[PDB]
Ligand binder design. Structure first.
Ligand SMILES: CC(=O)SCC[N+](C)(C)C
Length: 287
């Protein structure tokens, strides 16, 4: 039996990575390029919609629309769970990881309290895995997952310390079906990492929720994607594996029917999947 819906939401503060970013990586990389920061690149790039790492709004943007909430989206594409980014060259200008987004949010309150009614939305950890795989991190995956979990728990604790009371934390996504992971022959590594994060993180968050009297909702993105991918026609999806917009090894013309595709590029879902995800996340809350 379902439990009572949570109270309505009028303001979201979002923290996370390319699965949430609604323009920050674009703004920050333009700033870095202007300053001549060594190794800077324009992100996300030309085959993306209005600075989102997709062809349309991210899940948290759709969540805000569904709930009748204003969104302050602090998320930065590439953000790790700790202080820094997949893009190592950003650290010279800004710490854009979850920990750095939390520091910047708390430092910019301008003598105002944290809004105890605002939903603090956290969606991070994929970049920890992509960085470890792409640049040969030596940490065993079980230790990398434990660091991801610790970093997310520390973020919730630090936001709660400052006055936050309401959270929605998203699980790891199914990294094991990401086209770049499939192409890297890294399906089993992704499965082991995401299972370690998803078993441990909700245990840690439940303990913290009780200790600090928080309203903290857990969104299991893996259950969500397994249901979509097992029953795609129900959702109007046709292609679950091929990116609509190939970028590796080079950019090729986009598919004609992007709303029938799961993946936009080799790492990121389409606007259609972000829409279903944001509707699914909204299901725990009253409008
Ligand atoms: C989940 C993210 O923030 S990743 C963006 C894509 N990347 C792994 C190639 C940096």
């Amino acid at each position: 039996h379902t439990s009572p819906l949570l109270a309505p939401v009028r303001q979201i503060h979002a923290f996370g990575d390319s699965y949430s970013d609604n323009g920050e990586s674009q703004r920050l990389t333009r700033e870095m390029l202007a300053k001549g920061i060594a190794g800077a690149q324009a992100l996300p790039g030309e085959v993306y919609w209005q600075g989102r790492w997709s062809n349309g709004p991210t899940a948290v943007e759709v969540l805000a629309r569904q709930l009748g909430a204003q969104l302050a989206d602090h998320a930065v594409g590439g953000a790790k769970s700790g202080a820094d980014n997949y893009y190592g060259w950003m650290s010279a200008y800004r710490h854009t990881g979850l920990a750095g987004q939390v520091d910047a949010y708390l430092a910019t309150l301008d003598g105002k309290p944290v809004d105890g009614q605002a939903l603090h939305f956290i969606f991070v950890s994929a970049a920890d895995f992509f960085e470890h795989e792409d640049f040969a991190g030596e940490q065993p995956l079980e230790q990398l997952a434990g660091s991801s979990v610790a970093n997310i728990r520390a973020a919730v604790q630090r936001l709660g310390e400052a006055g936050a009371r309401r959270f929605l934390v998203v699980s790891s996504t199914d990294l094991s079906v990401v086209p770049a992971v499939v192409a890297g022959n890294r399906v089993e590594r992704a499965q082991r990492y995401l299972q370690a994060v998803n078993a441990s993180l909700p245990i840690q968050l439940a303990a913290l929720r009780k200790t600090r009297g928080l309203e903290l909702s857990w969104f299991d993105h893996l259950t969500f994607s397994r249901h979509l991918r097992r029953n795609p026609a129900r959702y109007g999806l046709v292609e679950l594996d091929a990116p609509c917009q190939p970028t590796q090894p080079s950019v090729r013309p986009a598919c004609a029917n992007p709303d029938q595709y799961y993946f936009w590029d080799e790492w990121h879902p389409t606007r259609r999947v972000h829409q279903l995800a944001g509707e699914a996340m909204a299901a725990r809350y009253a409008r």
